[PDB]
C-alpha cells in the first residue's frame, strides 16, 4: 500500500545509509576479489572458415 511502500522505501534508505559506513572499501574489495578467455583464439579463427565447409560437416 501507499503507507507500506513509503515505509519500505524509508527502511531501505536506512539500510543503505548504514551500509555506507564501509561501502566504498567493501565494494572495492568485493570487486577485486575463463574458459572462453582460453578459447578466444580458436573462436576468432573459427569465423575465418567459409560456408562451403559447413553443410559438408559429417556426423558420427
Amino acid at each position: 500500500e501507499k503507507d507500506d511502500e513509503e515505509a519500505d522505501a524509508i527502511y531501505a534508505a536506512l539500510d543503505k545509509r548504514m551500509d555506507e559506513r564501509r561501502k566504498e572499501r567493501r565494494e572495492q574489495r568485493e570487486k577485486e576479489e575463463k574458459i572462453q578467455q582460453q578459447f578466444s583464439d580458436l573462436k576468432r579463427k573459427l569465423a575465418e572458415v567459409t560456408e562451403e565447409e559447413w553443410l559438408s560437416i559429417p556426423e558420427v
Binding site: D3, A7, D8, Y11
Partner: protein
C-alpha cells in the same frame, strides 16, 4: 527535537502493515542496548532515554553507559566490600528462584 511525555508510549504499548513489520528487524539491537544500560547495584532507579516506534513495535534505549574509570572501579570495590560483609552475616542466604 521533541521529547514525548512518558505517559504516551505507556498507553500506546498497553493498548497494543509493513510499518509494523519493518521495525521488528532490529530487535537484537533493542536487546543489546537494554542489557548494556543495566543499572548498577548501588542504583535503585536508572532513568534512561528511550527511542520507540510510533506503533510500539520496538523500543530502543538511546544511550551509551559512559563512566569515569576510577569512580567505576571504586564503586565496585565498595560493592565487593559490602557484599562480602553481608554474606558473612547471613549464613542462610536465600537465592532467588529461577525463573
Amino acid at each position: 527535537k521533541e521529547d514525548m511525555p512518558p505517559e504516551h508510549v505507556r498507553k500506546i504499548i498497553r493498548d497494543h502493515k509493513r510499518v509494523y513489520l519493518g521495525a521488528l528487524k532490529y530487535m537484537p539491537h533493542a536487546v543489546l542496548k537494554l542489557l548494556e544500560n543495566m543499572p548498577m547495584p548501588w542504583e535503585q532507579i536508572r532513568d534512561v532515554p528511550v527511542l520507540y516506534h510510533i506503533t510500539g513495535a520496538i523500543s530502543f534505549v538511546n544511550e551509551i553507559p559512559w563512566v569515569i574509570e576510577p569512580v567505576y572501579i571504586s564503586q565496585w570495590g565498595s560493592m565487593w566490600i559490602m557484599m562480602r560483609r553481608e554474606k558473612r552475616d547471613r549464613r542462610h542466604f536465600k537465592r532467588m528462584r529461577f525463573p
